[PDB]
Amino acid sequence: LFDRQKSSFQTRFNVHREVTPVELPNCNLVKGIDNGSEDLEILPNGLAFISSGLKYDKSGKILLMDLNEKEPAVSELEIIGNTLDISSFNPHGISTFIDDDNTVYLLVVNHPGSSSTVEVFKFQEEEKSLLHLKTIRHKLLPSVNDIVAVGPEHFYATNDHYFIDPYLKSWEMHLGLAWSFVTYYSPNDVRVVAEGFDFANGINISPDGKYVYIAELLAHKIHVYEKHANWTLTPLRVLSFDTLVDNISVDPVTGDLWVGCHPNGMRIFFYDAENPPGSEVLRIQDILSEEPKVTVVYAENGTVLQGSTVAAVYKGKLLIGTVFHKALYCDL
Ligand SMILES: [Ca+2]
Ligand SMILES: [Ca+2]
């Protein structure tokens, strides 16, 4: 006789939340993005990569925007290589890593069918193209959501579920088992570095490499860890929010986290065109201090932008992307 399941479900999914709008000046929908912009990452030179076309006649693709232009226009990056099947390319989280000779690597979570891999590409800037280097999969990478690169083929990955089969995983989620987990992957060594998560989702790292941040979507929490020289993670603190936190970006200059969120779990998980999900963007400053300063920078009911997952800032501008629909480019 335990209504505990119903009340635990109602809080994880935030079932009655209604967005308090927070407005920005000069918001423009990005021309050419209509099939999602689930993750994005901006380089220090202002080039932004965006994954798009995620599925749970328009393919998965990676898009490029040059945010130094006054009206940035998106372009599709061509994938070259014969080691990747691009017909099933279905991109999700992404990360970059810039090596010492200045080579830019792009890592992309890919879901061909219901499996996960991480695809490593080298960015060829002049040609506007991604050279495929390699496809990574692993038994400890069953259901990958996002990664943060710490080398050309080294990364921490979140897995949003423990199970791969879609029936199993959807039950796994509804029951609140919280068996999802985080994996450190390298050529030499692959191991679980944290576990027990209710829907681990965004992940990122501080600019000095000392701290890893992990979003726990359905617990509405961001976990902060100290990252050791040997890649171990030790819990340092946990932030709680009243919203479902999706992808984390890090401002390289200050270290602030910028977070894409879903106010209402029902509207994002149980989709319908008559009642679309809204959007919400959080800024988090001084995440190690006694009180982190948390600010809603943008929030709206979804009549302009539906289902924000990610946001990042570049030179006074905010770029926001979503799981399945548009993207928004605003003044701060
Ligand atoms: Ca990412
Ligand atoms: Ca995500």
Per-domain residue ranges of the chain: 1-332
Please name every residue paired with 47 in a beta bridge, in sequence order, or none if there are none.
66
| 83 Cα: distance to centroid of ligand 1 (angstroms) | 23
DSSP alpha helix (H) spans, the chain: 4-12, 166-174, 265-269
What CATH number does domain 1-332 carry, 2.120.10.30, 3.40.50.300, 3.30.365.10, 3.10.129.10?
Answer: 2.120.10.30
Q: Characterise 147 by phi-psi region: left (phi > 0), alpha (psi -120 to 50), beta (else).
A: beta
Q: How far is CA 111 from the centre of its chain?
A: 15
CA–centroid distance, residue 27 to ligand 2 (Å):
23
Distance between Cα 160 and ligand 2 center (Å): 9
Contact of 326 with 291, CB cutoff 8 Å: no
Ligand number nearest CA of 51 is 1
- Span from the CA of 3 to the centroid of ligand 2 (angstroms): 30
Nearest by Cα to 325 from 110, 38, 18: 38
Residue 190 DSSP SS3: strand
Gap between the Cα atoms of 291 and 284, Å rounded: 10
Report DSSP state, residue 77: P
CA distance 166 to 182: 19
Q: Which ligand is nearest to the CA of 36?
A: 2
CA separation, residue 209 to residues 226, 250, 310 (Å) = 9, 11, 21
In degrees, rounded to 5, the angle at the alpha carbon of residue 67 between the alpha carbons of residues 252 and 72 is 160
Give the separation between CA 314 and CA 139, rounded to whole angstroms.
Answer: 37
Cα–ligand 1 centroid distance for 7 (angstroms): 32
In order of 40, 138, 185, 263, 277, the CA distances from 18 in angstroms are: 26, 40, 39, 7, 10
Cα–Cα separations (whole angstroms), residue 88 to 55, 58, 60? 10, 11, 8
Tell me which residues have their CB within 5 A of the ion that is ligand 1: 39, 93, 95, 146
Q: Is the dihedral of CA 63, 92, 219, 207 positive or negative?
A: negative
Half-sphere exposure in the Cβ direction for 205 (13 Å, CA) = 22
The alpha carbon of 6 and the centre of ligand 1 are apart by a number of angstroms equal to 32
Cβ-Cβ contacts under 8 Å for 179 (sequence gap 6 or more): 161, 162, 172, 195, 196, 197
- 131 CA to centre of ligand 1 in angstroms: 19
Q: How far, in Å, is the centroid of ligand 1 from the Cα of 145?
A: 9
Question: How far apart (Å, rounded) are the C-alpha atoms in residues 245 and 308?
Answer: 10
Q: Resolution in angstroms for this experimental structure?
A: 2.2
Cβ-contact 209, 227 below 8 angstroms: yes
Closest ligand to the CA of 312? 1
Q: How many CB atoms lie within 10 A of CB 318?
A: 20
What technique was this entry resolved by?
Answer: X-ray
Q: Give the closest ligand to the alpha carbon of residue 203.
A: 1
- Give the distance, in angstroms, between the CA of residue 278 and the centroid of all CA atoms in the same chain: 17
Cα separation, 214 vs 221, in Å, equals 8
CA of 167 to the centre of ligand 1 (A): 26
CA of 1 to the centre of ligand 2 (A): 35
Q: Which amino acid is at 88?
A: S
> 149-154: long-range contacts at Cβ-Cβ below 8 A with a sequence spacing of 24 or more?
149/95, 149/96, 149/97, 149/105, 149/107, 150/97, 150/205, 150/209, 150/231, 151/97, 151/186, 152/97, 152/99, 152/103, 152/105, 152/120, 153/120, 153/185, 153/186, 153/187, 154/184, 154/185, 154/186, 154/187
Strand segments, DSSP code E, in 47-162 are 47-52, 61-66, 74-76, 78-80, 91-98, 104-110, 117-124, 129-136, 144-151, 154-159
The residues that are catalytic are 92
CA of 68 relative to ligand 2 center, distance in Å:
26
Token pair in block for residue 25: 């000046």
Ligand at shortest distance from the CA of 250: 1
Return d(Cα 263, Cα 298) in angstroms, integer.
Answer: 12
Please count the CA atoms within 13 angstroms of the CA of 227 that sit on its side-chain side.
20
